[PDB]
Design a protein around this ligand. Structure first.
Ligand SMILES: N[C@@H](CCC(=O)O)C(=O)O
Lengths: 49, 49, 51
């Protein structure tokens, strides 16, 4: 059973002029189904019980 | 150290890491599990006796 | 709405992190993974037909 449920993030330094725009494009892709597509083509393969 | 501007990889968001560098919103919610070998069924019936 | 209008500092609760809201109010680190799910009644599976 799952424990220590902390996800994966794109890490940058404190200054990070891309900080705000990176997280929004991650959120937007979540709502756009973009990460769902990348989930299928790289993770969800099955072909094994 | 400045050799990288970004970390595009499975970096989990930790308190220790988040104190120094900053993370975007997660692109992959996950956690910790255990990996164990599949148990191939095989009867221990030595003989009919 | 009550954080945008400076009526309260924080908006704790079951708020979902959205792209639209993040453009007006800045969220925090998620403490619960959420999303979308679909609720359907039980359908059973019976037994295999070649026992
Ligand atoms: N949980 C959503 C509202 C409920 C829904 O999904 O409709 C939110 O925080 O805005």
């Amino acid at each position: 059973e799952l424990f220590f449920r902390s996800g994966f993030g794109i890490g940058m330094r404190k200054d990070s002029p891309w900080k705000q725009n990176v997280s929004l494009s991650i959120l937007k892709s979540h709502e756009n189904g973009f990460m769902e597509d990348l989930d299928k083509t790289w993770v969800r393969y099955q072909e094994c019980d | 150290s400045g050799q990288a501007d970004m970390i595009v990889a499975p970096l989990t968001i930790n308190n220790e890491r988040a104190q120094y560098i900053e993370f975007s919103k997660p692109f992959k919610y996950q956690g910790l599990t255990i990996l164990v070998k599949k148990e191939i069924p095989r009867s221990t019936l030595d003989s009919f006796m | 709405g009550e954080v945008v209008m400076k009526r309260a500092y924080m908006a704790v609760g079951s708020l979902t992190i959205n792209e639209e809201r993040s453009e007006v109010v800045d969220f925090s680190v998620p403490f619960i993974e959420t999303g979308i799910s679909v609720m359907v009644s039980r359908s059973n599976g019976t037994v295999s037909p070649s026992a």
